[PDB]
Amino acid sequence: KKRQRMIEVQDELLRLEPQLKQLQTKYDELKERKSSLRNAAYFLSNLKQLYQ
Amino acid sequence: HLNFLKKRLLQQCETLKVPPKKMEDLTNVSSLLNMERARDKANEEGLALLQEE
């Protein structure tokens, strides 16, 4: 029964292992996108003010 | 007299009846126990390792 328990715990571990990676990279890329777009909005507004 | 005693005991034990229960050789069983004990110990160790994992 402990050997079966090995089977399910290892299966759960190997299933959950990849799941972290895509979520981590998605969080990182969305945070970078948010920062970049906020900066870009700031610069476009500021340059529009300069032009006006 | 002791030879007569031995032969009467042999006849009594040959005539004696027992239910069909397997009973292994008298000398070796003890050794088996030791091995069996070791087996369990090894098993327990492995069990512990498994649980540890």
Q: Which residues of B touch A11 (CB under 8 A)?
A: none
Is the sign of the CA dihedral A41, A44, A48, A50 positive or negative? Answer: positive
Interface of A with B (CB under 8 A): 2-3, 5-6
User: What does the DSSP 8-state code read for residue B20?
Assistant: S
Give the C-alpha distances (Å, rounded to integers) separating B26 from A37, B23, B30, B32. 88, 8, 8, 11
CA-closest candidate to residue B32, choices B24, B20, B42: B24
Q: Residue B53 and residue A6: Cβ atoms within 8 Å?
A: yes
Q: How far apart are CA B41 and CA B34, in angstroms?
A: 11
Experimental approach: cryo-EM
State this model's resolution in angstroms: 4.6
Q: What angle do CA A35, A40, A42 make, to 5 degrees?
A: 100
Give the C-alpha distances (Å, rounded to integers) separating B32 from A12, B21, B27, B43. 41, 18, 10, 16
Q: Residue A6 and residue B51: Cβ atoms within 8 Å?
A: no
Residue B13, classed as helix, strand or coil, is helix
Q: How far apart are CA B42 and CA B34, in angstroms?
A: 12
Q: Which residues of B touch A6 (CB under 8 A)?
A: 50, 53
